[PDB]
Amino acid sequence: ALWQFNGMIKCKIPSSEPLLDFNNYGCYCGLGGSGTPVDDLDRCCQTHDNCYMQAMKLDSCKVLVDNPYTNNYSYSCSNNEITCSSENNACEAFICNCDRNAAICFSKVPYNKEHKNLDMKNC
Ligand SMILES: [Ca+2]
């Protein structure tokens, strides 16, 4: 769910408030997404978006009404390391992995403020 993803990013980037810093960035970081990614951070979000779409393709997810944004899963942050729990069932485990990969991706690429609140005209 959104609140777990928020925590994962903070696990990797302790100085940020992810829901503020990484929302409405480029063409993909935020609700929806289209066009060509503007930079590598934006590409991280495109990959994350594709991961969520793939998750909704799984038979294990189409059984629950929980949406990737509201579906809770278990994970831990320890020494700034993210670990998805084995207690997670099929759907939750896939989502957890999508989020973990994105959080790590976010922490490895440059952040370009020029792309914040980008005009959808570019997407
Ligand atoms: Ca998106």
Tokens of 98: 């999508």
Declared resolution, Å: 1.9
Residue 45 to residues 12, 69, 86, 90, 121, Cα–Cα distance (Å): 16, 14, 25, 22, 18
> Is 115 considered catalytic here?
no
Q: What's the Rg (C-alpha) of the chain?
A: 14
54 vs 112: CA distance, rounded Å: 28
66 vs 64: CA distance, rounded Å: 5
Those residues whose C-beta lies under 8 Å from the C-beta of residue 82, and which sit 6 or more positions away, are 8, 11, 12, 75, 76, 100, 103, 104
> Is 99 considered catalytic here?
yes
Q: Could you tell me which residues are beta bridge partners of residue 103?
A: none
Total number of domains constituting the chain = 1
34 vs 41: CA distance, rounded Å: 15
Taking the mean position of all CA atoms in its chain, how far away is CA 51?
9
Write down the experimental method used for this entry.
X-ray
The one catalytic residue among 42, 99, 115, 119: 99
Residue 9's nearest CA partner among 118, 114, 109, 87 is 109
Q: Which domain holds residue 112?
A: 1-123
- Ligand 1 centroid–CA 7 distance in Å is 18
Greatest CA separation for the chain? 43
- Ligand 1 centroid–CA 6 distance in Å is 14
- The CATH code of the domain that includes 41 is 1.20.90.10
